[PDB]
Design an enzyme around this catalytic site. Structure first.
Site, PDB file in Angstrom:
ATOM      1  N   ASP A   1      47.422  -0.241 -55.991  1.00  0.00           N
ATOM      2  CA  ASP A   1      46.828   0.101 -54.704  1.00  0.00           C
ATOM      3  C   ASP A   1      45.765   1.156 -54.892  1.00  0.00           C
ATOM      4  OD1 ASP A   1      48.243  -0.025 -51.454  1.00  0.00           O
ATOM      5  OD2 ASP A   1      46.336   0.944 -51.944  1.00  0.00           O
TER       6      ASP A   1
ATOM      7  N   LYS B   1      55.965  15.057 -51.861  1.00  0.00           N
ATOM      8  CA  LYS B   1      56.154  13.797 -51.150  1.00  0.00           C
ATOM      9  C   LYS B   1      57.633  13.456 -51.025  1.00  0.00           C
ATOM     10  CE  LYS B   1      53.662   9.801 -51.837  1.00  0.00           C
ATOM     11  NZ  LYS B   1      53.367   8.559 -52.606  1.00  0.00           N
TER      12      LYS B   1
HETATM   13  C1  LIG Z   1      50.863  10.744 -58.984  1.00  0.00           C
HETATM   14  C2  LIG Z   1      51.998  10.914 -57.992  1.00  0.00           C
HETATM   15  S1  LIG Z   1      52.007   9.621 -56.748  1.00  0.00           S
HETATM   16  O1  LIG Z   1      53.409   9.473 -56.372  1.00  0.00           O
HETATM   17  O2  LIG Z   1      51.433   8.485 -57.464  1.00  0.00           O
HETATM   18  N1  LIG Z   1      51.060  10.275 -55.646  1.00  0.00           N
HETATM   19  C3  LIG Z   1      51.391  11.333 -54.861  1.00  0.00           C
HETATM   20  C4  LIG Z   1      52.613  12.039 -54.876  1.00  0.00           C
HETATM   21  C5  LIG Z   1      52.860  13.124 -54.027  1.00  0.00           C
HETATM   22  C6  LIG Z   1      51.887  13.531 -53.129  1.00  0.00           C
HETATM   23  F1  LIG Z   1      52.145  14.572 -52.326  1.00  0.00           F
HETATM   24  C7  LIG Z   1      50.667  12.867 -53.072  1.00  0.00           C
HETATM   25  C8  LIG Z   1      49.642  13.320 -52.116  1.00  0.00           C
HETATM   26  O3  LIG Z   1      49.444  12.673 -51.094  1.00  0.00           O
HETATM   27  C9  LIG Z   1      48.867  14.537 -52.387  1.00  0.00           C
HETATM   28  C10 LIG Z   1      49.035  15.289 -53.523  1.00  0.00           C
HETATM   29  N2  LIG Z   1      48.240  16.329 -53.554  1.00  0.00           N
HETATM   30  C11 LIG Z   1      47.522  16.321 -52.476  1.00  0.00           C
HETATM   31  N3  LIG Z   1      46.554  17.201 -52.063  1.00  0.00           N
HETATM   32  C12 LIG Z   1      45.881  17.017 -50.853  1.00  0.00           C
HETATM   33  C13 LIG Z   1      46.188  15.919 -50.020  1.00  0.00           C
HETATM   34  C14 LIG Z   1      45.460  15.744 -48.745  1.00  0.00           C
HETATM   35  C15 LIG Z   1      44.884  14.516 -48.385  1.00  0.00           C
HETATM   36  C16 LIG Z   1      44.196  14.372 -47.182  1.00  0.00           C
HETATM   37  C17 LIG Z   1      44.093  15.478 -46.358  1.00  0.00           C
HETATM   38  N4  LIG Z   1      44.622  16.684 -46.654  1.00  0.00           N
HETATM   39  C18 LIG Z   1      45.285  16.786 -47.833  1.00  0.00           C
HETATM   40  C19 LIG Z   1      47.179  14.998 -50.420  1.00  0.00           C
HETATM   41  C20 LIG Z   1      47.866  15.179 -51.652  1.00  0.00           C
HETATM   42  C21 LIG Z   1      50.433  11.787 -53.931  1.00  0.00           C
HETATM   43  F2  LIG Z   1      49.248  11.157 -53.864  1.00  0.00           F
END
Ligand SMILES: CCS(=O)(=O)Nc1ccc(F)c(C(=O)c2c[nH]c3ncc(-c4cccnc4)cc23)c1F
Lengths: 251, 257
Positions: A129, A36
């Protein structure tokens, strides 16, 4: 120590999606990762620390039902690196795939979500959230809760809508809506497609989710549990450990 | 930051493994969890280094193919809190279950194992005890590498490289053990079946006249995997590849066929 991943170690791939903060890409780093990249370019020294503080909060989460933090980057842009999730979000299954889940899975998912949510509270972490969009089901079995490191008002508690309003109680309300989605098969206030209306009505206590929409399959043992979660009165809401115990007895 | 979990929070249950290394019970802590604890009156600090080392090596891993360390303990028994795992070991599946896999899954298991091993070495960690027994199959098809213990930064004889068998341990020893694990996946069988003497293996493998029979690989097995495997099993440390190259060759295969 430090979980920074030096520049050039991650092969950033396809753009997955965008959020209010961050853009998500699929990555290459000792296997599949998710990166991210922050909506930020420059190495601003003061927002740098602010970024690092959020990393500190992430690196205190070692639970199976919490999305696995793996590291962060600074040089090719500010970035959060986590595990990769196979499949789709809980929102996509419930609302975008129309996929039929057996009632046994639903409770498990709620149980898994409550396991993740209780852990964050134990570590004194307010998600702020929690919604089905931030609940990723890895291989459609395992819940991974993320996005906790002009918005989604459907999961918003009354006290949050009218402005410390962010607390462990508001996360409890958010979970009730999650339960609602799971146990009704859809989002609340579906008939009223008006954001401003909902904000005003849920805020004044005039509107609440409709439980006539739950299916017959739903155990009334935790159909009551939603009501506890969905309470306008925040102090009359159950804590998550209290919540975690009740949901678990259902099998 | 502290990963200490003071007691009372942890509700211990049914044990699955035991010994003099720490018994492992199935506890419940914010959900299903695992605890490996010393059932002692007092671990008079000879154990106190082993415990402290494992906490040091565990607290520095965050990978999907590495067992999830959740906490430690000091106040009563010494304990290590990790995620709970659902399923049996890779050893169980190939050998103790008599279950069988497609080529597709077999190469996948090697990849996920390679990812975790590549991760450990990147963090400058030597496993020193890699084998099918320490490779858990959680959710029935996802690799978890655990049982660090001998990690740093008898019965385990088959995965031992000559220089260890004849500090011997290195990234190269982990590499050799990886080749043995590959052998179990691509043959279904443990190495040196025609040798039921511990003394035969230990001398011969150490001497350099004993090596796994690569004629036993499956027909469906890729020619690239058999080639890769022979490189991990090199009698000489230097000729053994590193996991970045190991993972690279595997990735193509899994995508190729
Ligand atoms: C705990 C760390 S956070 O900062 O609170 N959250 C976070 C951080 C970084 C991120 F990239 C993701 C993320 O979107 C995803 C992290 N792993 C994933 N795997 C799959 C997907 C996804 C979601 C919808 C459709 N296709 C793929 C989305 C994500 C994330 F949720």
């Amino acid at each position: 120590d430090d979980w920074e991943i030096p520049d050039g170690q991650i092969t950033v791939g396809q753009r997955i999606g965008s959020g209010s903060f961050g853009t998500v890409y699929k990555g290459k780093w000792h296997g599949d990762v998710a990166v991210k990249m922050l909506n930020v370019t420059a190495p601003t020294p003061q927002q740098l620390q602010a970024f690092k503080n959020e990393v500190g909060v992430l690196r205190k989460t070692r639970h199976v039902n919490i999305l696995l933090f793996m590291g962060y980057s600074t040089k090719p842009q500010l970035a959060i690196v986590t595990q990769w999730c196979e499949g789709s979000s809980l929102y996509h299954h419930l609302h975008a795939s129309e996929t039929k889940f057996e009632m046994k899975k639903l409770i498990d998912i709620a149980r898994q979500t409550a396991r993740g949510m209780d852990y964050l509270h134990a570590k004194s972490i307010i998600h702020r959230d929690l919604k089905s969009n931030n609940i990723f089901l890895h291989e459609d079995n395992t819940v991974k809760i993320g996005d906790f490191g002009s918005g989604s008002i459907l999961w918003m508690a009354p006290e949050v809508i009218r402005m410390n309003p962010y607390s462990f109680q508001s996360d409890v309300y958010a979970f009730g809506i999650v339960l609602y989605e799971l146990m009704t098969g859809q989002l609340p206030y579906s008939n009223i497609n008006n954001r401003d209306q909902i904000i005003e009505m849920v805020g004044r206590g005039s509107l609440s989710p409709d439980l006539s929409k739950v299916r017959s399959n739903c155990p009334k043992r935790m159909k009551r549990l939603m009501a506890e979660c969905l309470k306008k009165k925040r102090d009359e809401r159950p804590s998550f450990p209290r919540i975690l115990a009740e949901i678990e007895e259902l099998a």
